[PDB]
Write a protein that binds this ligand. Structure first.
Ligand code: HEM
Ligand code: HEM
Ligand SMILES: O=N[O-]
Ligand SMILES: O=N[O-]
Ligand SMILES: [Mg+2]
Ligand SMILES: [Mg+2]
Lengths: 303, 299
């Protein structure tokens, strides 16, 4: 549709059961990312045509250094390399390229991931590939329901995640961060203590009032308002891993303003008020990066 | 004697395999196995749509101890085949979980680990998934000639009588595919390597395909009697890292599996399976899956 800016298909879908994230560095000349990105989004359209019931979406997104090159420095004014927070409590592993694929069918996501790798070829060095899965009752592996207060429905998710006007219209900022859960440590905590750590009840998933939970509770850290206006984000996080090996949450969020994500990280990691998130008692982040997801027509026009 | 629930279900969408060694007292496996099979029954009741099943199976040394040397006459440690071309990684314990729902399998695998606790040392945990059109990652449909329906699957996989009635022998072997090597082959050449056409999945006449084709290696008859097995194999891995097929088969006789391995790996006639051009096995083990009644009678 001329004069408009179409969002990449992976930002908005809700309740998808499976995802693949690929994070990679650029190995050679940045020009190689131009044709590869166009091939990949075309492949996504082909898979959507072949598998209409998968409800597939995907996003290509770029780190600061390569996006500044590809854009000539226009727009994406908030973009920067992911900093450390809490002096290293949240480590930084900023890469050049993020691919996020999500759908109702893991097997379709796998084919799409293979297509991404064929498009980019040896221009990229893959740093990790994570297969996310929705767990029972949409719970995080800790046993708490994850997603309840996420923006709901296309209209509100667009408001929160999608830039509305100007050169970046239809684009979004992305944050990804892989957490490694220590479930043995979690299971040493009583359920009441776990509920004070999160800020919601475990079985029934009821919010515990802000004046009845510690300021270190996760909800107290991240449910932030500025003069009454919530700093909302669109989360796409999923569980990942093996039962006997590494497992946790692959955190992913989209926002039209990087600012909202950063304020939540400054809060969680001790930089705002000297207190940190209680979830650090059982889980820790081991990666972190910021990316810019251009509109689809900005990709299709790379050249 | 009732069969363990994971042998017979067809067309699973996802599986988890856990291979482990015994670190503690062999007697710890008795109570743990009973706990786990009860967990599986509870999960089936909670998730009836999942069509969940699971199997606990034991390596030769531990099974001889748990059984007092009675039955399981064919059981032995997995040897190398082809003098080492197929490696051997025999462990003490196999747990196989399968269903329509990966997330249910994950909860079941956590329950297995809780039941066995620190008596076991996990050596491998593999998450299988059914790919598009039930194809192996090579692009060839996998499973077409597998026994179909409970009647025939019981005939092939489940021991009929005696002390082992309701049990089965299990073989597991992880393969690592090199899809770059595969993709350098023309499609006609790939078809002659497998023995079936790629898109349409039609058998190529045995008289017109190479004797090294996969089907010529594994579709074996003895005076016209097919040496059938029940395969539960699935794709696994990451797109950018290691990926392949996790091969898994059940049979009432270990013999049928072993004859296929001797054929594939050059021991029978000096010829090897043509798929070794692009994929290779990296683990291998044999296990005995007792009936449920036998498990209940352990401790
Ligand atoms: C180990 C990692 C994490 C776990 C297990 C986790 C878990 C949860 C849970 C259980 C909830 C409550 C239900 C819900 O409304 O979704 C929640 C809410 C939320 N989380 Fe997290 N989370 C993690 C990391 C993060 C990070 C890193 C951020 C932000 C940078 C974040 C932002 C949010 C937000 C904004 C909410 C909604 C709060 C509200 O408005 O009520 N989470 N999370
Ligand atoms: C890389 C590993 C393997 C791959 C990709 C593979 C793939 C295939 C394919 C594409 C077929 C044809 C369709 C079908 O009927 O299922 C097939 C058939 C079969 N495979 Fe394999 N296979 C592998 C390993 C093995 C092993 C290790 C064995 C036995 C020990 C085996 C036994 C069989 C049998 C019995 C059949 C049916 C043959 C017939 O009666 O037509 N396969 N396999
Ligand atoms: O709130 N973590 O998706
Ligand atoms: O024939 N391999 O499942
Ligand atoms: Mg709130
Ligand atoms: Mg035949």
């Amino acid at each position: 549709p001329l004069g408009m800016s179409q969002v990449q298909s992976g930002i908005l879908p809700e309740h998808c059961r499976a995802a693949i994230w690929i994070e990679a560095n650029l190995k050679g000349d940045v020009n190689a990312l131009r044709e590869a990105s166009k091939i990949f989004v075309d492949n996504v359209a082909t898979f959507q045509a072949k598998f209409p019931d998968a409800k597939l979406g995907a996003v290509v997104a770029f780190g600061n250094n390569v996006w500044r090159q590809l854009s000539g420095g226009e727009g994406a004014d908030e973009l920067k390399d992911f900093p450390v927070y809490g002096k290293g409590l949240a480590p930084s592993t900023q890469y050049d390229l993020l691919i996020h694929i999500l759908s109702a069918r893991h097997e379709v996501n796998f084919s799409v991931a293979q297509a991404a790798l064929a498009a980019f070829g040896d221009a990229i060095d893959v740093k990790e590939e994570i297969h996310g899965f929705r767990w029972v009752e949409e719970r995080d592996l800790s046993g708490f329901v994850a997603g309840t207060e996420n923006p709901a429905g296309e209209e509100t998710r667009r408001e929160v995640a999608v830039i509305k006007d100007g050169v970046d219209a239809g684009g979004s900022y992305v944050f990804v961060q892989r957490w490694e859960h220590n479930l043995k440590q979690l299971n040493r905590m009583s359920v009441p203590d776990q509920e004070m750590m999160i800020g919601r009840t475990k079985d029934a998933n009821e919010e515990i009032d802000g004046d009845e939970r510690p300021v270190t509770s996760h909800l107290s850290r991240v449910d932030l308002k500025e003069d009454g206006k919530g700093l909302k984000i669109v989360r796409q996080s999923l569980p990942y891993g093996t039962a006997s090996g590494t497992h946790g949450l692959y955190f992913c969020a989209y926002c039209a303003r990087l600012y909202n994500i950063e304020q939540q990280l400054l809060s969680m990691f001790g930089d705002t008020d000297g207190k940190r998130d209680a979830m650090l008692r059982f889980t820790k982040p081991v990666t972190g990066g910021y990316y810019f997801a251009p509109s689809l027509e900005r990709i299709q026009a790379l050249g």
